[PDB]
Amino acid sequence: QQLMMILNSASDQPSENLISYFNNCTVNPKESILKRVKDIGYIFKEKFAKAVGQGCVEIGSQRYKLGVRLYYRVMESMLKSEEERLSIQNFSKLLNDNIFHMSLLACALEVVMATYSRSTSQNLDSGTDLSFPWILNVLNLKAFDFYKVIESFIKAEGNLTREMIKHLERCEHRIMESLAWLSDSPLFDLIKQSKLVPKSTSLSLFYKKVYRLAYLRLNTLCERLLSEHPELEHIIWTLFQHTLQNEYELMRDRHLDQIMMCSMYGICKVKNIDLKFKIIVTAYKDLPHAVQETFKRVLIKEEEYDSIIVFYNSVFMQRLKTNILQYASTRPPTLSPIPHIP
């Protein structure tokens, strides 16, 4: 409640302290910042009304206002954290970056929407869902660009409720597990970039997170399904990890967990160990946020969708067969480092 309290009594302007940071910029960002806030406001309000109906436009307008107040607040908190850490205070390049601002604003708004859109005024007659990632489509922001701001947003805002931190974490796993891998995602550019040269701190840090989430799920399923065969987890993890890293195309418009399950099946197959898809899939929906659609509606060719089994045999295999054979070969691939968890 406290954060909502603060935001309601806060001004619509950037504080004086915050102004000081714009002044200490080589190119003062203040103009571009306010212009952006102004422009995005028209768009947000337009999309909000479209979803909600003709009623009282004051509601949407206040949600944007609160969003912008959180935005300014967290921005100043971030600039203080960075001034304290690196004892620098000319953040001209950061404060002028369009994507930085769009991400911060997007996130601020998502907190305000999620705290308020917890109301039964929810199943809109319009048909549109205000829930994440609705905000991303409104602001026309790529899920990957949004993911980058979440960790810093949490650190910068100590008044987030446990539930809201939890919700932002869940937004982050959704970017990592599927959303950042949608067709137009700038993620693929960064990957192809890294293919030509051995240069991306953010990509490797993104990948580091993806691995933590991936292995943590692999682990859960292995301790349940493959107790009898304790050695399989590291081998399956090597296949999984190799697929994310070198057959990344398989992730396009698909889901991290689809790759996870085909890797378990695939390795058990070449190891002549009996673990059928039904057993894998059955244990899978016991996982926290698992949904049937993930194994019953998998992208195959173009607009075709089918079960994970059809995906395994008609797409996954045609692509990974040779690498899969290496695990039961005279010289098997060296095992990939297991991610650190708790």
Side-chain angles (χ1 to χ4, degrees):
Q1 172 186 36
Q2 287 195 17
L3 221 199
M4 267 17 269
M5 220 110 70
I6 294 182
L7 299 181
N8 277 133
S9 305
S11 163
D12 292 323
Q13 308 287 76
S15 75
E16 255 308 323
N17 193 326
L18 211 244
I19 263 73
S20 287
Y21 283 98
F22 304 156
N23 296 338
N24 293 185
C25 283
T26 311
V27 183
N28 204 324
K30 197 183 59 181
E31 286 313 308
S32 66
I33 289 181
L34 303 170
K35 170 172 185 59
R36 190 187 294 96
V37 160
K38 186 192 198 294
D39 293 335
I40 298 311
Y42 288 113
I43 300 181
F44 178 98
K45 292 162 188 169
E46 154 67 22
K47 298 291 185 60
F48 194 93
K50 214 151 187 286
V52 139
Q54 295 195 26
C56 330
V57 315
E58 311 91 9
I59 306 287
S61 203
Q62 266 289 307
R63 288 209 201 178
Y64 188 75
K65 282 185 172 192
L66 293 173
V68 162
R69 297 180 195 165
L70 186 53
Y71 166 73
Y72 282 135
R73 166 179 160 106
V74 170
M75 193 192 302
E76 168 183 339
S77 162
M78 290 186 52
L79 297 175
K80 287 183 177 186
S81 306
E82 233 69 306
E83 159 150 19
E84 179 161 341
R85 199 171 72 96
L86 305 171
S87 34
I88 146 177
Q89 34 64 236
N90 190 352
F91 299 88
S92 180
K93 279 219 151 210
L94 175 60
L95 294 171
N96 283 301
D97 184 55
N98 173 49
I99 295 296
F100 162 67
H101 287 283
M102 292 305 289
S103 293
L104 192 62
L105 212 210
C107 195
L109 286 167
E110 170 66 21
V111 176
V112 173
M113 294 283 299
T115 70
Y116 283 81
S117 294
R118 181 166 48 99
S119 288
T120 35
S121 321
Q122 229 155 21
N123 308 72
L124 301 163
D125 290 318
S126 171
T128 86
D129 189 350
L130 293 178
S131 217
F132 187 88
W134 177 79
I135 186 59
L136 293 192
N137 199 32
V138 176
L139 275 44
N140 186 37
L141 176 82
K142 290 283 175 261
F144 181 69
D145 294 329
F146 184 96
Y147 141 84
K148 289 161 60 206
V149 85
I150 300 172
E151 190 181 308
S152 291
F153 196 105
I154 305 303
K155 303 174 205 166
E157 185 50 73
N159 282 305
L160 296 171
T161 69
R162 170 169 67 164
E163 290 71 24
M164 185 47 55
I165 292 175
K166 183 133 63 74
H167 165 74
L168 289 171
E169 269 199 348
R170 183 54 195 149
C171 285
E172 192 188 49
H173 303 344
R174 292 168 70 179
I175 313 272
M176 301 183 304
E177 83 190 358
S178 71
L179 292 182
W181 306 85
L182 304 159
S183 275
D184 293 343
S185 182
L187 185 263
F188 296 108
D189 294 348
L190 264 67
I191 288 171
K192 278 141 56 183
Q193 220 156 115
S194 85
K195 258 28 189 168
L196 297 180
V197 183
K199 55 200 188 319
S200 183
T201 298
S202 53
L203 182 63
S204 55
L205 293 168
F206 168 70
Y207 260 107
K208 189 167 79 153
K209 288 171 156 294
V210 163
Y211 298 147
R212 267 200 280 273
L213 179 63
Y215 170 78
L216 200 268
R217 296 169 179 173
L218 213 213
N219 177 234
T220 304
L221 288 183
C222 282
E223 291 190 348
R224 169 175 186 176
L225 266 19
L226 299 175
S227 319
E228 300 288 324
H229 309 85
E231 77 280 354
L232 277 172
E233 173 183 273
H234 213 335
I235 301 164
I236 305 180
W237 168 244
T238 297
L239 201 217
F240 191 8
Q241 193 277 341
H242 162 259
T243 301
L244 290 171
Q245 192 184 192
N246 308 131
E247 306 291 342
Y248 59 84
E249 299 98 346
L250 265 6
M251 277 292 286
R252 191 190 300 273
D253 300 324
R254 293 202 183 85
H255 192 293
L256 183 69
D257 297 340
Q258 284 151 4
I259 299 311
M260 172 180 60
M261 284 179 275
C262 299
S263 286
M264 291 174 62
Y265 192 84
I267 291 307
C268 288
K269 256 297 182 297
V270 301
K271 287 298 178 183
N272 197 196
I273 291 198
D274 194 34
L275 177 61
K276 29 191 87 70
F277 258 117
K278 188 153 190 174
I279 309 290
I280 286 175
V281 148
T282 274
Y284 170 73
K285 40 192 176 165
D286 288 2
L287 296 180
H289 302 286
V291 55
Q292 308 185 181
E293 215 162 336
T294 303
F295 59 83
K296 289 191 197 277
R297 195 176 189 285
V298 183
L299 170 62
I300 307 307
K301 255 55 185 173
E302 293 164 321
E303 211 68 84
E304 289 183 4
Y305 291 79
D306 217 330
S307 65
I308 192 169
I309 308 180
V310 178
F311 168 73
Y312 170 89
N313 287 293
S314 74
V315 174
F316 188 74
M317 260 291 313
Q318 110 220 318
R319 180 72 166 174
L320 277 157
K321 164 190 277 301
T322 53
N323 185 101
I324 296 177
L325 289 163
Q326 292 186 208
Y327 297 94
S329 86
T330 153
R331 55 276 166 180
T334 149
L335 275 14
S336 294
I338 303 288
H340 168 75
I341 304 304

